[PDB]
RNA sequence: AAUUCUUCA
RNA sequence: CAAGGAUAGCACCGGUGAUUGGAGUUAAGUCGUAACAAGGUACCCCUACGAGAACGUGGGGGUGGAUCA
RNA sequence: AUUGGGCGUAAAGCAAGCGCAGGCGGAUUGAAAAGUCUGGUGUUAAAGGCAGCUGCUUAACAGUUGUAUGCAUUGGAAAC
RNA sequence: CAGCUAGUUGGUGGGGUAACGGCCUACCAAGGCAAUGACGUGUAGCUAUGCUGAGAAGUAGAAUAGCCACAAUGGGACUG
């Protein structure tokens, strides 16, 4: 996350959990600027699934974003 | 200039010294060494108070002070403005600059906020070389 | 014609008794449309010197054309050990030069051109360097005539 | 035909060509003679074929080893030179190389710049068409 | 090995010590201060496997391998014959 | 500063009025010289590029009421993109809220409009604003919080105020729109664009 | 053999 | 293995140091007047000696010298 | 002082010479590709520099999209 | 700042480490780096960058972030 005070902008990124917040990452996924919950999160929709299939666990808030856009249904059935 | 020499002999810059060497050094107490942080100003104590005549083109009777700073250096400095409030080992604060009437003197005195207070009756340019504004 | 003047000196010859104070003036004249000239004169009084300078400048005019409002190549004014570099400018950005050269190149009728002085800053030799730099140039029609080509391709 | 006068190269035909042509232009001379190489005939051809010079003849002898060359200068009546100046860039004491994207134009590109490419010595813009770089030998205006 | 083909052509100087040869390599580049073309020579001590021999005066090739000893990180593959 | 507080003091020295001629027209003695103890001919002492360039700068930035750092920001903004600098600068200096309200006929002086806008008695595209900083783009509507209908200054302005050509408005409904960009010849021509623009070499 | 001519423009 | 401890001897870099050598800069300070003209003994350069100094002289070299030529 | 200076009188040609190393260097021809030319592949974190766009009463700013530059590897031609 | 270099360079057996390896060890050796600048000394965390500049670049390595090192100073080892 990085942005202005009183107006945060948290970019959703998949990265190892042993590095500090908003530090160096590997690949970019998307961003969230909180002013609405209908259409404010956008992802490439391919690299995220590649990361989740090559070994990854979504961050706590990221599950809602994956559920809002409708990606979980194709995910679980892909695994089993 | 033949380039076959410049590879074997690189060029050098002059990088002339600063206008103030004394205002750069600082001194600690840790088996003191010499370091410089390009200080804008330094605190010191005066030891000598007197007067001296200027050079050829003009004539006056100025006033100078021999101040030892927080470092081991002792340096001359110029007292600006009307009046005089230096009384033979009172703490002082220096300021950069340069004068032309007194050779060997390159430091003015910040007059107004110390045991030395800048004189009144000076209202134009009273911020520089401090002087408290009268209330009206 | 706009008849703008530039830096004037204060000179005096020396004889028996005082000194003969008689300063000189230099001036540039131009119609801002292609015809320009310069002159230098001397006299005892201001109006007489100014008038003589205007006369000697205006009789000795010379012609120069305007290519899209600027120069299309670089010239290096080289006279009296005083270089000055002129580099082409786009369709328009605003005039950029030194004061004396600013007047010189504005009174010629140019829109904007890249100008930078080198060496000394003496106005008279500076003006002369600007002159021989701007004059000794050549036109695309000139190379079209001398080369075996109709139009520059 | 029987030049009758001994001549020799300067240190390098590249600089010698420009120096001799500049001296001929300054002194208002007609022709000069200089040691000929395949680089020399190539450069003379590619510079004359752009209207900046005139007929040039390469001159060899009974043997196949001794070659020279003399070139006619481009001129117009009243003797005003077509060439307005030369300045060599690549030097025997300093090699210079330039890629395609940074080949400078001749003061607006109006003139001609000679670039020695990997396959042929030939002028600036028609080399920019093929994007083939090389070294710049001389600015002629 | 699988690494990039190290092109380290140079005049091998001496195999003064057994199964070890010292070769100098010459590299030309553009000096980033005056754009002048300049060369440097650098020494490298490499291991000779034994099935192929490198001799004095040759201009040989050098490739990278696992470290065998101190400042010996390379091995020889091709040897250009003498002159 | 936001406001100097004196307007005649500069129209005297600079020699040209804030408005058409109505401010410096006559009030007991018509004068066209510099004020103070120096009523005297001063036109052949400091005539040079820098002097009149500074004079034109000062004239312009007291015509538009803006300070110098605000205009430096404006010039930095207009320098970013392509376009003739003089035209864009003269177009953006007219694109302030107070000056547009003046030109609409809703205020008899630009400074009154500047005070009113900061006082929040005008709507910017159905939204309130107290910062006269935005540049007015075409296709925008303006209304003055029609509660202002009883204000005597606004009805006095709308009585017979000068309607500007480049703007459209209805005074009986206090509703206006900014349709077209200003031309060079439609605005006060006392400012020499080349001289004022050429003064700026620091950026 | 042969000398010096007080600072300030 | 060994941080350290003790001992003794080399290497490098500072601070200060009685006394002294000169250096620069200063309203009108004391001796002579060396140089700028042929500066009134041409000057200058190198070198050696000598004098309170200005510098003098000896040897070699140049005109960056004057008129008569 | 590479783009961008000079060594007669303004600072600067060593008193002169012999010259190892280094640097520079006549013409033909083939090869080689070390430089030099050049297609492709990979890479040069993000932010920021820059160019458009969106939002905070608007610039400040925040976000988003794109943006050069160097380097390795591989394939091609040989004027110098 | 003209020599530096003695586990220093190389070989074979063995041990040790996550692994190559003088990392260590038994023996044999006598090498290796240096005017294309080691060694000695002086100052310095490096980089993306910030400022300036048209640029080649001069300069500060703010904040921020990538990497490295440190935890009163000098050492040692366990746990995992």
UniProtKB/Swiss-Prot annotation, chain C:
UniProtKB keywords: Ribonucleoprotein, Ribosomal protein, RNA-binding, rRNA-binding
Molecular-function GO terms, alphabetical: rRNA binding; structural constituent of ribosome
Ranges for domain S5 DRBM: 1-64
Listed GO biological process terms: translation
Signal sequence bounds: none
A Gene Ontology term for the protein's cellular component: small ribosomal subunit
Disulphide bond pairs: none
Keyword Ribonucleoprotein recorded: yes
Subunit structure: Part of the 30S ribosomal subunit. Contacts proteins S4 and S8.
Entry's family note: Belongs to the universal ribosomal protein uS5 family.
Protein's job: With S4 and S12 plays an important role in translational accuracy.
Protein name: Small ribosomal subunit protein uS5
Species, as recorded: Mycoplasma pneumoniae (strain ATCC 29342 / M129 / Subtype 1) (Mycoplasmoides pneumoniae)
Lineage, uppermost ranks: Bacteria, Bacillati, Mycoplasmatota, Mycoplasmoidales, Mycoplasmoidaceae
Gene: rpsE
Full protein stretch here: 66 to 218 of 219
Curated annotation (Swiss-Prot), chain D:
UniProt keyword annotations, A-Z: Ribonucleoprotein, Ribosomal protein, RNA-binding, rRNA-binding
UniProt cross-references to InterPro entries, sorted A to Z: Ribosomal_uS8, Ribosomal_uS8_CS, Ribosomal_uS8_sf
A single BP term in Gene Ontology: translation
Any one annotated GO CC term: ribonucleoprotein complex
GO MF assignments: rRNA binding; structural constituent of ribosome
Subunit comment: Part of the 30S ribosomal subunit. Contacts proteins S5 and S12.
Family statement drawn from the similarity comment of this UniProt entry: Belongs to the universal ribosomal protein uS8 family.
Chain's role: One of the primary rRNA binding proteins, it binds directly to 16S rRNA central domain where it helps coordinate assembly of the platform of the 30S subunit.
NCBIfam families in alphabetical order: PRK00136.1 (NF001109)
Entry protein name: Small ribosomal subunit protein uS8
Species this protein is from: Mycoplasma pneumoniae (strain ATCC 29342 / M129 / Subtype 1) (Mycoplasmoides pneumoniae)
Curated annotation (Swiss-Prot), chain E:
Record-linked InterPro entries: NA-bd_OB-fold (IPR012340), Ribosomal_uS17 (IPR000266), Ribosomal_uS17_bact/chlr (IPR019984), Ribosomal_uS17_CS (IPR019979)
One GO term (biological process): translation
Domain of life: Bacteria
Family annotation (Gene3D superfamilies): Nucleic acid-binding proteins (2.40.50.140)
Methyltransferase listed as a keyword: no
Molecular function via GO: rRNA binding; structural constituent of ribosome
Keywords, in A-Z order: Ribonucleoprotein, Ribosomal protein, RNA-binding, rRNA-binding
GO CC, alphabetical: cytosolic small ribosomal subunit
PANTHER family referenced in this protein's UniProt entry, alphabetically: 40S RIBOSOMAL PROTEIN S11 FAMILY MEMBER (PTHR10744), SMALL RIBOSOMAL SUBUNIT PROTEIN US17M (PTHR10744:SF1)
Family: Belongs to the universal ribosomal protein uS17 family.
Function description: One of the primary rRNA binding proteins, it binds specifically to the 5'-end of 16S ribosomal RNA.
Oligomeric form and interacting partners: Part of the 30S ribosomal subunit.
Protein name listed in UniProt: Small ribosomal subunit protein uS17
Swiss-Prot record, chain F:
Annotated SMART domains: Ribosomal_S4, S4
Gene3D superfamilies according to UniProt: Ribosomal Protein S4 Delta 41, Chain A, domain 1, RNA-binding S4 domain
Molecular function per GO: rRNA binding; structural constituent of ribosome
S4 RNA-binding domain: residues covered: 95-156
GO cellular component: small ribosomal subunit
Pfam family, one: S4
Highest rank taxon of the organism: Bacteria
Keyword Glycoprotein (UniProt): no
PROSITE patterns in the cross-refs: RIBOSOMAL_S4, S4
Database matches in CDD domains: S4
UniProt keywords, alphabetically: Ribonucleoprotein, Ribosomal protein, RNA-binding, rRNA-binding
A single BP term in Gene Ontology: ribosomal small subunit biogenesis
Assembly mode: Part of the 30S ribosomal subunit. Contacts protein S5. The interaction surface between S4 and S5 is involved in control of translational fidelity.
Function field: One of the primary rRNA binding proteins, it binds directly to 16S rRNA where it nucleates assembly of the body of the 30S subunit.
Family: Belongs to the universal ribosomal protein uS4 family.
Cited HAMAP family: Ribosomal_uS4_B
Name by which UniProt lists this protein: Small ribosomal subunit protein uS4
Protein source organism: Mycoplasma pneumoniae (strain ATCC 29342 / M129 / Subtype 1) (Mycoplasmoides pneumoniae)
């Amino acid at each position: 996350r990085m942005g202005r005070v009183h107006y945060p902008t948290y970019r959703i990124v998949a990265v190892d959990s042993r590095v500090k917040r908003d530090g160096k990452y590997i690949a970019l996924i998307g961003h969230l600027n909180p002013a609405l919950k209908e259409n404010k999160c956008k992802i490439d929709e391919a690299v995220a699934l590649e990361w989740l299939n090559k070994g990854a666990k979504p961050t706590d808030t990221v599950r809602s974003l994956f559920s809002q856009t409708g990606l979980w249904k194709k995910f679980v059935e892909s695994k089993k | 200039a033949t380039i076959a020499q410049l590879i074997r002999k690189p060029r050098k810059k002059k990088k002339v010294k600063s206008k103030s060497p004394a205002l750069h050094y600082n001194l600690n107490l840790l088996n003191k060494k010499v370091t410089n942080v390009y200080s804008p100003l330094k605190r010191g104590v005066c030891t000598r108070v007197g007067t001296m005549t200027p050079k050829k083109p003009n004539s006056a009777l100025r006033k100078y002070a021999k101040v030892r700073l927080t470092n081991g250096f002792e340096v001359l400095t110029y007292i600006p403005g009307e009046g005089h409030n230096l009384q033979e080992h009172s703490v002082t604060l220096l300021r950069g600059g340069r004068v032309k009437d007194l050779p060997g003197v390159r430091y003015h005195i910040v007059r107004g906020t110390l045991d030395t207070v800048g004189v009144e009756k000076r209202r134009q340019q009273r911020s520089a070389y401090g002087a408290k504004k009268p209330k009206a | 014609f706009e008849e703008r003047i530039v830096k004037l000196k204060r000179i005096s010859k020396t004889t028996k008794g005082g000194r003969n104070m008689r300063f000189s003036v230099l001036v540039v004249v131009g119609n801002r449309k292609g015809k320009i000239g310069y002159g230098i004169a001397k006299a005892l009084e201001v109006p007489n010197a100014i008038k003589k300078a205007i006369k000697a400048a205006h009789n000795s005019l010379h012609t120069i054309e305007i290519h899209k409002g600027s120069i299309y190549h670089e010239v290096i004014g080289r006279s009296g050990a005083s270089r000055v570099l002129l580099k082409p400018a786009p369709q328009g950005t605003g005039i950029i030069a030194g004061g004396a050269i600013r007047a010189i190149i504005e009174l010629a009728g140019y829109s904007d051109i890249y100008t930078k002085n080198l060496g000394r800053n003496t106005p008279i030799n500076m003006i002369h360097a600007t002159m021989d730099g701007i004059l000794k140039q050549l036109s695309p029609r000139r190379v079209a005539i001398l080369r075996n080509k109709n139009l520059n391709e | 035909i029987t030049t009758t006068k001994p001549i020799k190269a300067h240190f390098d035909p590249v600089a010698d060509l420009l120096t001799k042509i500049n001296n001929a232009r300054k002194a208002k001379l007609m022709t000069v003679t200089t040691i000929a190489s395949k680089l020399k005939i190539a450069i003379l051809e590619i510079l004359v074929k752009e209207g900046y010079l005139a007929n040039f003849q390469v001159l060899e002898n009974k043997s196949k080893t001794k070659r020279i060359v003399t070139f006619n200068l481009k001129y117009t009546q009243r003797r005003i030179p077509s060439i307005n100046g030369v300045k060599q860039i690549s030097k025997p004491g300093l090699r210079i190389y330039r890629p395609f994207e940074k080949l400078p134009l001749v003061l607006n590109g109006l003139g001609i710049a000679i670039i020695s490419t990997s396959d042929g010595v030939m002028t600036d813009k028609v080399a920019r068409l093929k994007k083939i770089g090389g070294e710049i030998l001389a600015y002629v205006w | 090995k699988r690494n990039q083909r190290k092109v380290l052509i140079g005049i091998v100087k001496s195999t003064k010590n057994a199964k070890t040869a010292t070769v100098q390599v010459e590299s030309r580049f553009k000096h980033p201060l005056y754009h002048k073309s300049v060369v440097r020579h650098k020494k490298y001590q490499a291991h000779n496997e034994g099935e192929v021999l490198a001799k004095d005066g040759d201009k040989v090739q050098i490739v990278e391998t696992r470290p065998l000893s101190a400042t010996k990180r390379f091995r020889i593959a091709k040897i250009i014959e003498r002159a | 500063m936001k406001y100097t507080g004196s307007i005649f003091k500069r129209s005297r020295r600079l020699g040209f009025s804030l408005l058409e001629n109505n401010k410096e027209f006559s009030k007991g003695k018509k004068r066209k010289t510099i004020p103070g103890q120096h009523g005297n001919r001063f036109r052949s002492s400091t005539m040079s590029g820098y002097a009149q360039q500074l004079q034109e700068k000062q004239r312009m930035q007291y015509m538009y009421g803006i300070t110098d750092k605000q205009f430096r920001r404006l010039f930095r903004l207009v320098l970013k993109q392509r376009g003739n600098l003089a035209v864009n600068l003269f177009r953006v200096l007219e694109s302030r809220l107070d000056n547009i309200v003046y030109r609409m006929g809703f205020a008899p002086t630009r400074r009154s409009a500047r005070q009113l806008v900061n006082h929040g008695h005008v709507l910017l595209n159905d939204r309130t604003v107290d910062t006269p900083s935005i540049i007015l783009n075409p296709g925008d509507k303006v209304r003055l919080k029609a509660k202002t209908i009883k204000i005597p200054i606004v009805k006095a302005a709308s009585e017979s105020g000068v309607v500007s050509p480049f703007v459209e408005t209805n005074n009986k409904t206090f509703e206006g729109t900014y349709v077209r960009f200003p031309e060079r010849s439609e605005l006060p021509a006392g400012i020499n664009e080349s001289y004022v623009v050429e003064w700026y070499k620091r950026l």
